[PDB]
Enzyme design. Structure first.
Site, PDB file in Angstrom:
ATOM      1  N   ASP D  31       0.862  -1.179   0.000  1.00 11.44           N
ATOM      2  CA  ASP D  31       0.000   0.000   0.000  1.00 11.44           C
ATOM      3  C   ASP D  31       0.898   1.227   0.000  1.00 11.44           C
ATOM      4  O   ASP D  31       1.374   1.656   1.052  1.00 11.44           O
ATOM      5  CB  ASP D  31      -0.920  -0.015   1.217  1.00 11.44           C
ATOM      6  CG  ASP D  31      -1.967   1.086   1.176  1.00 11.44           C
ATOM      7  OD1 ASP D  31      -1.698   2.111   0.515  1.00 11.44           O
ATOM      8  OD2 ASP D  31      -3.024   0.934   1.838  1.00 11.44           O
ATOM      9  N   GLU D 123       0.917   1.939  13.788  1.00 11.40           N
ATOM     10  CA  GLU D 123      -0.172   1.877  12.817  1.00 11.40           C
ATOM     11  C   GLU D 123      -1.318   1.128  13.485  1.00 11.40           C
ATOM     12  O   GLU D 123      -1.489  -0.080  13.268  1.00 11.40           O
ATOM     13  CB  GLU D 123       0.255   1.192  11.524  1.00 11.40           C
ATOM     14  CG  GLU D 123      -0.891   1.166  10.498  1.00 11.40           C
ATOM     15  CD  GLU D 123      -0.480   0.453   9.226  1.00 11.40           C
ATOM     16  OE1 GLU D 123      -0.149  -0.750   9.296  1.00 11.40           O
ATOM     17  OE2 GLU D 123      -0.471   1.102   8.168  1.00 11.40           O
ATOM     18  N   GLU D 132     -10.075  -4.206  15.387  1.00  8.17           N
ATOM     19  CA  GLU D 132      -8.853  -4.806  15.926  1.00  8.17           C
ATOM     20  C   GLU D 132      -8.525  -4.311  17.335  1.00  8.17           C
ATOM     21  O   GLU D 132      -7.737  -4.935  18.049  1.00  8.17           O
ATOM     22  CB  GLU D 132      -7.657  -4.568  15.007  1.00  8.17           C
ATOM     23  CG  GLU D 132      -7.777  -5.228  13.634  1.00  8.17           C
ATOM     24  CD  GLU D 132      -6.506  -5.074  12.811  1.00  8.17           C
ATOM     25  OE1 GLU D 132      -5.410  -5.520  13.274  1.00  8.17           O
ATOM     26  OE2 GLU D 132      -6.588  -4.518  11.701  1.00  8.17           O
ATOM     27  N   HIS D 280      -5.588   0.116   1.511  1.00  8.86           N
ATOM     28  CA  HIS D 280      -6.004  -1.235   1.868  1.00  8.86           C
ATOM     29  C   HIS D 280      -7.026  -1.247   3.001  1.00  8.86           C
ATOM     30  O   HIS D 280      -7.511  -2.316   3.362  1.00  8.86           O
ATOM     31  CB  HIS D 280      -4.770  -2.101   2.224  1.00  8.86           C
ATOM     32  CG  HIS D 280      -4.239  -1.880   3.607  1.00  8.86           C
ATOM     33  ND1 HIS D 280      -3.546  -0.746   3.974  1.00  8.86           N
ATOM     34  CD2 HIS D 280      -4.300  -2.657   4.711  1.00  8.86           C
ATOM     35  CE1 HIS D 280      -3.225  -0.823   5.254  1.00  8.86           C
ATOM     36  NE2 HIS D 280      -3.666  -1.976   5.723  1.00  8.86           N
TER      37      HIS D 280
HETATM   38  C1  LIG Z   1      -2.551  -3.078  12.235  1.00  7.05           C
HETATM   39  C2  LIG Z   1      -1.251  -3.627  12.719  1.00  7.05           C
HETATM   40  C3  LIG Z   1      -1.084  -4.199  13.892  1.00  7.05           C
HETATM   41  C4  LIG Z   1       0.282  -4.702  14.222  1.00  7.05           C
HETATM   42  O1  LIG Z   1       0.505  -4.548  15.636  1.00  7.05           O
HETATM   43  C5  LIG Z   1       0.660  -5.814  16.244  1.00  7.05           C
HETATM   44  N1  LIG Z   1      -0.025  -5.768  17.543  1.00  7.05           N
HETATM   45  C6  LIG Z   1      -1.375  -5.749  17.761  1.00  7.05           C
HETATM   46  N2  LIG Z   1      -1.684  -5.668  19.036  1.00  7.05           N
HETATM   47  C7  LIG Z   1      -0.478  -5.637  19.686  1.00  7.05           C
HETATM   48  C8  LIG Z   1      -0.109  -5.541  21.046  1.00  7.05           C
HETATM   49  N3  LIG Z   1      -0.980  -5.418  22.049  1.00  7.05           N
HETATM   50  N4  LIG Z   1       1.202  -5.516  21.348  1.00  7.05           N
HETATM   51  C9  LIG Z   1       2.096  -5.609  20.361  1.00  7.05           C
HETATM   52  N5  LIG Z   1       1.886  -5.707  19.047  1.00  7.05           N
HETATM   53  C10 LIG Z   1       0.579  -5.703  18.766  1.00  7.05           C
HETATM   54  C11 LIG Z   1       0.097  -6.835  15.261  1.00  7.05           C
HETATM   55  O2  LIG Z   1       0.681  -8.118  15.474  1.00  7.05           O
HETATM   56  C12 LIG Z   1       0.507  -6.192  13.935  1.00  7.05           C
HETATM   57  O3  LIG Z   1       1.871  -6.454  13.626  1.00  7.05           O
END
Ligand SMILES: *C/C=C/[C@H]1O[C@@H](n2cnc3c(N)ncnc32)[C@H](O)[C@@H]1O
Ligand SMILES: *C/C=C/[C@H]1O[C@@H](n2cnc3c(N)ncnc32)[C@H](O)[C@@H]1O
Ligand SMILES: *C/C=C/[C@H]1O[C@@H](n2cnc3c(N)ncnc32)[C@H](O)[C@@H]1O
Ligand SMILES: *C/C=C/[C@H]1O[C@@H](n2cnc3c(N)ncnc32)[C@H](O)[C@@H]1O
Lengths: 4, 343, 343, 343, 343, 4, 4, 4
Positions: D31, D123, D132, D280
């Site tokens: 993207d 992001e 999410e 996206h």
């Molecule tokens: C939209 C992208 C999300 C990215 O962030 C990671 N992620 C989601 N939620 C968490 C938490 N709580 N801690 C660390 N990293 C997080 C996803 O895995 C994705 O790469």
């Protein structure tokens, strides 16, 4: 349409 | 009953069958000017309905009864003579209004009401206001109205104005001239041409039009539903004296109507005039057998006489003359058999 | 009379009133396929009329009687029950055929003719052939026919075939779902959803269509007017078994008809099939409330049942099932109240 | 613990599994609007990174941490809970940035950082911004933020507007109408049509559309990430009052979002509006089971209520009414099970 | 129970959530080959159901139970573990079969049945037959089967065949080569390219194909459901030796399956082969890590080993060699995470 | 332009 | 679409 | 494609  | 003595049973049967169809209810309900104005007239005059007793004459699907309930009415008696009464009852049940709306199937001239009402609501207007002769049932219903009760609509205005429409006039002969041929598959049809012309001219034209075809300011005939009696609608004489605003050939008279809901809080108008958004009533035009020439400043005087018939309509007699020249014309029309010209 | 006992009076009044209008006569006469084919069938079988006695049932303006006169008929009795009979007499006089065409006003079941006739001519076909129940009057008139007499038309073929037309189905379906609104102006209509769908899909659709929409070869039901008795038309049972030539959704059955004039010189056909030039009968389609899914090679079997009613029409019952899956569709339609979709 | 108390283990497992795939990393990285705008926001605001301590929340493959390094950051803590953290450390080594980017595997709610940071980058935006529930982790990470620290993105704007799209509505309506069949292979499914319509219309539609379908200027709801507390996102109430600019059927509300990077040199915007190049995230549309009719000039008012659930998403409730008529629509949607219509 | 011991609870919650949606039922029901063949198999073998006791394992919406009811079954117990069971019993009451179809919510391994059954019906087939591991529940249900009872389907054949698809093979490196770039917004991604290649090759490809890619007659691995034990499906060793009919590069193995309903009257087959019309099971292809050159007349021998895992799927181990050259390849794939390449 |  |  |  119209009445009657 | 008063309805039976007034109506051929063949006309009544076909009339109430027509209003038994949900598609016909839908057509009227989708007229936003019509349905929206009725809702506003009732809701914005909520004090005329709050905790009141209401009679709905010819309720159809019951939409006006629901508006009265939205406005806080205590009890609404919804009378409907067609089989649509069965569908209205289903809606009252499904809208949880069994305590406040009571559907009474039958003719308002023949049913029984348990009590007098504070206000009557109805949609008794036909083409040219008077067609279908439903206003008589509306006035008849005043026998259930408390001494100082109200009526929604309260008054009705019929407007008349002379028009010029050369193409509409010549169209009648184009169609009738089908018969003016000496060998239609070997047959001479010409002897019926005059009868064909007369037939087309007896038909009022239900259509809308541009307001610049009108040649003089409209003349108004008013019915006060709070005061009028049933018998006043059997013979409706509308004298007119138009002061011509434009010069040209007058081919007939145009008709439209407005009703007023005169409430305690405000007056709301429902207008079918050609200067207003189109409704499912459109407008009505009656042609003259012979056009009349008039110049601006002239006066076109005459009489429109509506004689009620037993097919739930009126025989229309229009006589007109240009006072300055003496030339006159007339026509006899059957409001029961109009020509629906709009596309 | 046989007519009075089988017809409601409100419907008969409405019916003959409709046919009293010259504009309605013109609309039928301007159908050149209809009028030209009738003249062809009569003039080309002139030996069937030369010096013969003729009965014209429901003559309208009298055009078929004039054709019989052109073919050399010695005397023609032209029976018509509407007020068009008086216009027919005018044409007979203006065409100088008073010595050969005798207009007899009245219903053919109630008049009395002075003699038996060699041949009966009529246009008894309505929509889907059977609408208007005029075929019964046509068969009734055989009491006046001599032993080896003829009939024009002689036979009638009704064709039916399954069709697919998603646009038509969705048009009717969308109309009925107006009554799905849970909050039309704050009112819940949804309880009437099922009633609305039933009403809309009870209407046969009168218009024309491209033959590409037909999913199988037509099945045909034949009525021999020379042999059929009036009472045969009270209950018409048309079984069918279609071999589906295409896969897709079966949205209903399409109907049309042909009639044959089996003369002594040649047989002339008048066809309203969709493969033929358009006529004022168009074609008729009965929609299924819920379409049936069929595969090419499947068989669609069932029965079309027409019960004559007192409104000069038929209650239609169409039950159809895809034999390979047991998928079934039962439908009732009111032939008297169709949806005229053509534009 | 904060994370595990608000998320069901099962859902968290498949969530971080999904983000462990390099295919998914490629899909977001490709993207160019998204990736290029982030690099622009960071590099053009290099003074917010020069010699600063940075936290990258949910770094994925680490791209934003590489941008922070390009802008001069002294130290970047890149936290990532999925198995993608292993790949990020590979890239840090291969790009010879081990002295500046420190990958910390785990959930930002559970890891330990050696120091406070000057700025947080992330992001956290999903569909409709809030899907999410990653914004809560983004806000949670503010415990590591120095008193006047910055956040990239700094604010987020959710836009909503009513739209007309009969084709989309009928597409979903027709799918649900499969359960209207009374004889699917001989089985009556019609009893389930209500449940089918409910299930199908609970699905937000994720795709793009032409701006001509919007019937009013959007209403905007703003979240200031510098001030918001993560508990502020458990229950999001968005009242709305639209001034209708076009007449027609309102089939639902469309949603999109913009985020702003408010740096010391310039503010950079990332927009997912339908007037902007496609991203996206596309756009999101919540359909009404029954559209609302509205006239230009009317006001459409109501409330969009987002309640967070344990599946890392939101239960959506949209109540809307046309003030002029009382026409009302209440809807419930499941943001975690959308319909991806883009093709 | 047996089910929970063999299944991760997190995999089980997603599995049964997926089948609780009416849209998923609709997808399977709309598969005419699937639904039509099940109906014919049951109705054409009416003597296997008439006045019998039937068990429907995983009835979903209940369509197979209605087919069994159509065939004259005396009593049908329909077991369903997802929330679709609520919808099934709505249909049972709606089709007036409360007396003959008993809906039992829960897993067939944990529910209690009153009485043993004469025949078990079910649709336990997933991708390449075994996916989802429902065949074990199907076989487990034989604890309720009468000693000489029957099963519908009775046997299943999984087919394996070598294929050539140069574009599919090269497509994996085209997608992985996204990572083979030294300055993606300034970042060298190349160190992850090999991991990206590995990721793609672990995914079976679910789509259809032209049969011209198949290079030899398939080998067939047959399961007799009347004889097989649940434990026979934990480790499924499929040896193969293909007699190559075409010379070229072999890129992997294609999979499909058939099941047979062996009734007393006749045997009916449901086939998902690429020579047959497409079903919602499509076909499955597993690539070798390196292609093998084979000439027509060569033999390609090896083993496809399916090892069941706790995610209701199988780890696929394929080893193959061209015997006449010694050229060998292999791959290890995760059937739980297939790539849906169809459009 | 139809019959009835 | 496909089964699962 | 999109983000889920
Ligand atoms: C939209 C992208 C999300 C990215 O962030 C990671 N992620 C989601 N939620 C968490 C938490 N709580 N801690 C660390 N990293 C997080 C996803 O895995 C994705 O790469
Ligand atoms: C224009 C709408 C008329 C509605 O009123 C019903 N209606 C006509 N005439 C009567 C009488 N005498 N009693 C009750 N309802 C009546 C029509 O059926 C239509 O719904
Ligand atoms: C389709 C044309 C019908 C014409 O026949 C006339 N008509 C109908 N039914 C009768 C009966 N029973 N007797 C005489 N004429 C009849 C219609 O009036 C029309 O002209
Ligand atoms: C392919 C369709 C499977 C259907 O069967 C149901 N199902 C799977 N596994 C079980 C068990 N163990 N008990 C009952 N029902 C089961 C699926 O939910 C789907 O409806």
């Amino acid at each position: 349409a119209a009445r009657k | 009953s008063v309805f039976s003595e007034r109506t051929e049973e063949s006309s009544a049967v076909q009339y109430f069958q027509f209003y038994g169809y949900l598609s016909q209810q839908q057509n009227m309900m989708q007229d936003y000017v019509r349905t929206g104005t009725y809702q506003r007239a009732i809701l914005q005059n909520h004090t005329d309905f709050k905790d009141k007793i209401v009679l709905d004459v010819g309720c159809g699907s019951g939409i006006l009864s629901f508006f009265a309930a939205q406005a806080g009415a205590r009890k609404i008696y919804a009378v409907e003579a067609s089989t649509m009464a069965q569908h209205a009852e289903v809606l009252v049940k499904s809208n949880n209004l069994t305590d406040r709306i009571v559907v009474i199937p039958g003719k308002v001239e023949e049913v029984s009401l348990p009590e007098q009402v504070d206000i009557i609501i109805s949609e008794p207007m036909g083409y040219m206001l008077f067609n279908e002769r439903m206003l008589e049932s509306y006035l008849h219903a005043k026998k259930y109205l408390k001494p100082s009760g109200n009526m929604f609509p309260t008054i009705g205005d019929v407007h008349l104005a002379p028009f010029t429409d050369e193409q509409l006039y010549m169209e009648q002969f184009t169609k009738a001239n089908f018969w003016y041929q000496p060998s239609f598959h070997g047959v001479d049809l010409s002897a019926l041409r005059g009868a064909a012309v007369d037939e087309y001219f007896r038909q009022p034209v239900v259509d809308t039009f541009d307001i610049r075809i009108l040649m003089a300011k409209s003349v108004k005939y008013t019915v006060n539903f709070l005061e009028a009696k049933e018998g006043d609608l059997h013979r409706i004489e509308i004298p007119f004296k138009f002061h011509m605003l434009h010069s040209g050939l007058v081919h007939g008279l145009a008709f439209w109507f407005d009703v007023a809901f005169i409430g305690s809080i405000m007056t709301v108008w429902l207008s079918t005039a050609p200067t207003e958004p189109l409704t499912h009533w459109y407008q009505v035009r009656c042609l003259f057998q012979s056009p009349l020439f008039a110049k601006a400043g002239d006066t076109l005087s005459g009489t429109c006489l509506l004689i009620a018939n037993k097919r739930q309509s009126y025989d229309i007699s229009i006589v007109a003359q240009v006072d300055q020249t003496g030339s006159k014309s007339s026509n006899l029309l059957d409001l029961k058999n109009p020509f629906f010209r709009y596309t």
